[PDB]
Design a protein around this ligand. Structure first.
Ligand SMILES: Nc1ncnc2c1ncn2[C@H]1CC[C@@H](COP(=O)(O)OP(=O)(O)OP(=O)(O)O)O1
Ligand code: SF4
Ligand SMILES: [Ca+2]
Length: 1118
DNA sequence: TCGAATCCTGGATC
DNA sequence: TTTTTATCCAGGATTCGA
């Protein structure tokens, strides 16, 4: 014990002296102060009995820049349940048995949503146990739970206790939940000495955030040519940073051959970036100066791009070589999870945001690309191997490179990252860096814990994972799942609003539409717009125009017209599907509970039934065959946990080992004994949703939905006010307005992020509120909605592309489009409607609306009032100028999820899926695909368009047939090389073979394991001819070899090309040109020529032949 | 000996 | 002690049937 006690006191006193050094004095004096809460960390402190107890530190920062700490003592606890009447006997036994370790025990009636017949108002007694310290809590937990495990498996006093709950919420989460303390608010803190607990009370009238000191830093180092750096070998060359918009540079005058003057680097007036420079004689003085300047300026946020991977481990390892210690000078230390942390300031890494919340493609995750897109300028680059000569040859262009990435890290953090995390913390009980690092499911669970606590619900336990469960007909399941979203790719080629197109249409559909126009217009005005139809005067003229247009269409259905291209999209579909049906993870019920519920009377209306599709995958072996395989394990012997350990018996396997050994036997036996390894069985089920259950989940979803639109509105209002303030030109008003704009923008994004999170959480393994039914019923109802939206549109027009929530289509030029009504409302003198929207919203209204919605009108009365609700509405984007869809090289298929679209202005609207955006992909194909889509805008008819794109492909085929005749050799390498990336370490692929693995081994052979050592490797290779007939995986040759020393390059090529006397090693001699020609060929086909053959034009490029199935079909049709 | 189907991985679209 | 799902493309290799 005493070792633990003194360890805890030692670390507490060290941390308290460290944060005292940075100025976070503890609040000492009787009095009241106010401050913005910025951080919290758990700590233990002595009580009036001189006994340790658990506490939490709160860190406050004041308006004037002063800072203070406060410690709040609080006792952790958990709940247990007992059989009839046992609570007095059990609590007395508990208190005598664990005497001195458990502080208090008490009986509490809790409302648990799983109690049979609970809707009448019953609830059950849980005993609470509360402890002096979490150290003592864990021991009693471990003494208790072995009896609960046996009691649960069946279902003295200790035998009687039947369950335990809430035993695994973290201590600071529990404290933030229970006392409602949240970060980025303003508080009053009232202190009275040890005589009484310190009191913290929020005040909502202070709105301006303070401005914490932010430091952003980057480092540059030496390394050996053509190899990765390592901290035992390589010195640091320079370190550069910004603090609150002033920049500094430190330079090592060993390597760098001259002093560097001070200078300004300013990408745009938005980013001033002044820098001031210190020249130091040694690495040790360079590293001394940085720690001195941090201890001087005492930052509260430290930021660096991907610093946890390289920069921090490097500057730590280089400090140890000079007898300094980062953990004593600064205070940062590497946690068990391999991430740096400190008590006194927060380490925020932009790349955890870029990777989670930006919706950039992985190709754009490179720092300079992210800056290019988000900040709209190009930084400068140096080739990583020229830096070491540049340092001697021309120092200041290296300094100019080194600055650019500090500047870009600082302004990227300030603009995008900073408002988002400090907005998102205002609604979630977590630390800022936890909120950044944690997954969105964990962010979404704590919120429901907060909402369940105040409703006095008791948290359910985490979900138990089943292993190798049986199908209900006795077959072991490898999986369970639900069928997801629906996709179709109906048509291919080029659609342009500039060229005629042929339509054929059902006149009874136009008649059906014309017969109901007024319903659709009324419903679109009253229910969506919320303008009563009596307030509009010109209504009948608009209906006369719409009817006469439909009548004109109904006479002549088959026609040639220019197209109109429309996208129709459901807004926030899945939340609205939840809100409309009252789906809740607890609300799904079986026959057995309804049979017990007193409301289950004839004429009750509470049972709503909905359908979903289950899809198991199961093995062919029978139950008895599996059980005989298990019996064959009853006598088996197994290897030890480690080579020194004794051989294990079957009960000494873990349940995961037993499961995997049963999988190994059962799969192998099935493989031999049966023809195919598994069988699928898609199956239809129906599930009841109790309409009267407690509404806390759906009310949370609704509240977030409403707040998002409120903050969007205020954001647009304040942005307009910002434009007005900018025209006024007064800096104080502009600054105030900008602050309000950023506040509402960040709140709006936070609320969108949480709204989007609610769908994903309910399927997470281990989730407290988990169900599979609700997630399947949502996807199925969305698929029914989009199927009926396809069925309707196929008769009015032609759908082109259909996906999870929306449809692309063409409509005939004479279709109604948009109409403007005139209204007497003073705020709303005009209203504009689009007929394609109202046409579908009236279809959704009739089928989907829910007639059973109930709410409890008077909690004491047991009276519920029936309602109705329907929240699902379509909206209309566009129209667009042009739309180009590709086609498949196989006969019976078309490509889904790929297309391009252009705006009316000819600017690129969308370009989805194509290689032009993907990471690690062949540049020649990227440039081709880029140039063709811009070429489709040219020309004036299909035969002009297909004639005019062909000249872009014949340029590149002239290149590949010329072997780059004029092209200077430095261009060719980047044009031709791939750049694929390998996720796992080289061992972990095991037996698997691939071009990346095969070129990783080729790197190990060439440079040693000093390069394979870490994951996330990237491989650049060419593919080579000379090993004739050998499969392609063997011919990958690393690009690096073309920069090696001649005697190394020749030796290794002669080893790899198996060509002993080979005279020429020129890349033009080695390239397998006919591989690349057929890579280009299969892309030019799929874009230009197969779709052309689908639009009654001949092959527009002679050099590339059709596939034989198309050659037959064309020859026979001719 | 020759052709088709299944499998695995890295990365995108909703 | 952790951890959001499902549908789809392109490339390369291995096994079974005619
Ligand atoms: N990252 C993700 N994780 C899980 N499901 C996702 C997802 N992204 C999309 N989905 C699924 C679930 C939602 C669905 C997209 O349809 P909505 O209309 O709900 O989303 P949206 O178009 O973004 O909203 P709008 O801009 O119209 O307001 O795709
Ligand atoms: S659906 Fe009706 S009968 Fe069944 S549990 Fe709910 S309230 Fe009771
Ligand atoms: Ca949508």
């Amino acid at each position: 014990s005493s070792v633990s006690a003194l360890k805890r006191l030692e670390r507490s006193q060290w941390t308290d002296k460290m944060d005292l050094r940075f100025g976070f004095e503890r609040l000492k004096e009787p009095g009241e102060k106010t401050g913005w809460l910025i951080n919290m960390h758990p700590t233990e402190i002595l009580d009036e009995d001189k006994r340790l107890g658990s506490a939490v530190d709160y860190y406050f920062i004041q308006d004037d820049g002063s800072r203070f700490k406060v410690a709040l003592p609080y006792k952790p606890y958990f709940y247990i349940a007992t059989r009839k009447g046992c609570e007095r006997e059990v609590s007395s036994f508990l208190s005598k048995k664990f005497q001195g370790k458990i502080a208090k025990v008490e009986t509490v009636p809790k409302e648990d949503l799983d109690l049979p017949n609970h809707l009448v108002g019953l609830k059950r007694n849980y005993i609470r146990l509360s402890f002096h310290t979490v150290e003592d809590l864990v021991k009693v937990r471990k003494e208790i739970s072995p009896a609960v495990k046996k009691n649960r498996e069946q279902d003295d006093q200790l035998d009687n206790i039947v369950d335990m709950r809430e035993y695994d919420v973290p201590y600071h989460i529990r404290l933030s939940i229970d006392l409602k303390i949240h970060v980025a608010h303003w508080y009053n803190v009232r202190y009275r000495g040890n005589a009484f607990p310190v009191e913290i009370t929020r005040r909502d009238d202070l709105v301006e955030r303070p401005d914490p000191v932010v430091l952003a830093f980057a480092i540059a180092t030496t390394k050996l040519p053509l190899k990765f750096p390592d901290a035992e070998t390589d010195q640091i060359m320079m370190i550069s940073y910004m603090i609150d918009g002033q920049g500094y540079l430190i330079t090592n005058r060993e390597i760098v051959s001259e002093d560097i003057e001070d200078f300004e680097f300013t990408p745009k007036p938005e980013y001033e970036g002044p820098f001031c420079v210190f020249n130091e004689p040694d690495e040790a003085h360079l590293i001394q100066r940085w720690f001195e300047h941090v201890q001087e300026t005492k930052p509260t946020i430290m930021v660096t791009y991907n610093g946890d991977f390289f920069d921090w481990p490097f500057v730590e390892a280089r400090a140890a070589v000079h007898g300094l210690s980062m953990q004593q000078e600064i205070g940062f230390q590497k946690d068990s999870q391999g991430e740096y942390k400190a008590p006194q300031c927060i380490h925020m890494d932009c790349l955890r945001w870029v990777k989670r919340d930006s919706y950039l493609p992985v190709g754009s995750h490179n720092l300079k690309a992210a800056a290019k897109a988000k900040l709209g300028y190009d930084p400068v680059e140096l080739d990583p191997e020229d830096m070491c000569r540049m340092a001697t040859e021309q120092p200041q262009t290296l300094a100019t490179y080194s600055v650019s990435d500090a500047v870009a890290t600082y302004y990227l953090y300030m603009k995008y990252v900073h408002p988002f995390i400090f907005a998102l913390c205002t609604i979630i009980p977590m630390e800022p860096d936890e909120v950044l690092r944690k997954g969105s499911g964990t962010l979404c669970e704590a919120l429901l814990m907060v909402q369940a606590f105040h409703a006095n619900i008791i948290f359910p336990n985490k979900q138990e994972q089943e292993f190798n469960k049986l199908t209900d007909d006795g077959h072991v399941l490898d999986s369970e799942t639900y069928v997801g979203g629906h996709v179709e790719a109906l048509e291919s080629g080029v659609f342009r609003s500039d060229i005629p197109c042929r339509f054929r249409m059902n006149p009874a559909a136009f008649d059906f539409l014309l017969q109901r126009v007024e319903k659709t217009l009324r419903h679109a005005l009253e229910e969506e717009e919320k303008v009563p139809v009596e307030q509009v005067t010109n209504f009948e003229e608009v209906c006369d125009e719409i009817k006469s247009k439909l009548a004109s269409l109904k006479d002549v259905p088959s026609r040639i017209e220019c197209p109109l291209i429309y996208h129709l999209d459901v807004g926030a579909m899945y939340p609205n599907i939840i809100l409309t049906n009252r789906l809740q993870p607890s609300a799904m019920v079986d026959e057995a509970t309804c049979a017990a519920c007193d409301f289950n009377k004839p004429g009750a209306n509470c049972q709503r039934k909905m359908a979903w599709q289950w899809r198991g995958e199961f093995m062919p072996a029978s139950r008895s065959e599996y059980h005989r395989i298990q019996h064959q394990l009853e006598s088996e012997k197994f290897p030890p946990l480690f080579p020194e350990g004794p051989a294990r018996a079957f009960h000494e396997l873990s349940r995961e080992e037993q499961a995997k050994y049963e999988k190994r036997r059962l799969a192998d036996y099935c493989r031999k004994a049966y023809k195919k390894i598994h069988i699928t069985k898609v199956e239809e089920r129906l599930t009841t949703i109790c309409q009267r259950e407690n509404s806390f989940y759906v009310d949370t979803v609704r509240a977030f939905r409403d707040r998002r639109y409120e903050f969007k509105g205020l954001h647009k209002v304040w942005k307009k006010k910002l434009s007005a303030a900018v025209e006024v030109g007064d800096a104080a008003e502009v600054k105030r307005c900008k602050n309000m704009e950023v506040l509402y923008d960040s709140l709006q994004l936070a609320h969108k992020c949480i709204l989007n999170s609610f769908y994903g959480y309910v399927m997470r393994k281990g989730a407290r509120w988990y169900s599979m039914e609700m997630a399947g019923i949502v996807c199925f109802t969305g698929a029914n909605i989009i199927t009926q939206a396809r069925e309707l549109i196929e008769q009015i027009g032609r759908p082109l592309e259909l996906d999870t929530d929306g449809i692309w289509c063409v409509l005939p030029n004479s279709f109604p489009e948009n109409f403007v009504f005139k209204t007497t409302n003073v705020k709303k003198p005009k209203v504009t409607i689009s007929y394609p929207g109202a046409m579908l919203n009236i279809m959704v209204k009739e089928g989907f609306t829910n007639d059973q919605y109930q709410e409890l009108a008077e909690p004491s009365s047991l009276t519920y009032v029936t309602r109705s609700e329907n929240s699902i509405f379509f909206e209309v984007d566009g129209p667009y100028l042009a739309m180009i869809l590709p086609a498949s090289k196989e006969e019976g298929k078309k490509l889904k999820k790929r297309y391009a679209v252009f705006n009316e202005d000819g600017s690129l609207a969308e370009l989805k899926g194509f290689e032009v955006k993907r990471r690690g992909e062949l540049q020649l194909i990227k440039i081709f695909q880029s140039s063709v889509f811009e070429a489709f805008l040219k020309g004036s008819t299909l035969e002009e368009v297909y004639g005019s794109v062909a000249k872009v492909a014949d340029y590149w085929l002239d290149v590949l047939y010329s072997k780059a005749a004029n092209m200077p050799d430095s261009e060719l390498f980047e044009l031709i090389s791939e750049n694929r990336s390998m996720s796992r370490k080289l061992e972990d692929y095991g037996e698997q073979k691939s071009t990346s693995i095969s070129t990783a081994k080729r790197l190990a052979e060439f440079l040693g394991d000093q390069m394979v050592k870490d994951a996330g490797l990237s491989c650049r290779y060419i593919i080579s001819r000379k090993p004739e007939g050998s499969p392609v995986t063997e011919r990958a040759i690393p690009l690096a070899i073309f920069q090696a020393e001649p005697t190394v390059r020749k030796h290794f090529l002669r080893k790899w090309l198996k060509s002993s006397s080979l005279q020429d090693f020129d890349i033009r001699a080695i390239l397998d040109w006919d591989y690349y020609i057929e890579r280009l060929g299969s892309a030019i086909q799929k874009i230009i020529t197969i779709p052309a053959a689908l639009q009654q034009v001949k092959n527009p490029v002679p050099r590339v032949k059709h596939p034989d199935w198309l050659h037959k079909k064309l020859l026979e049709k001719n």
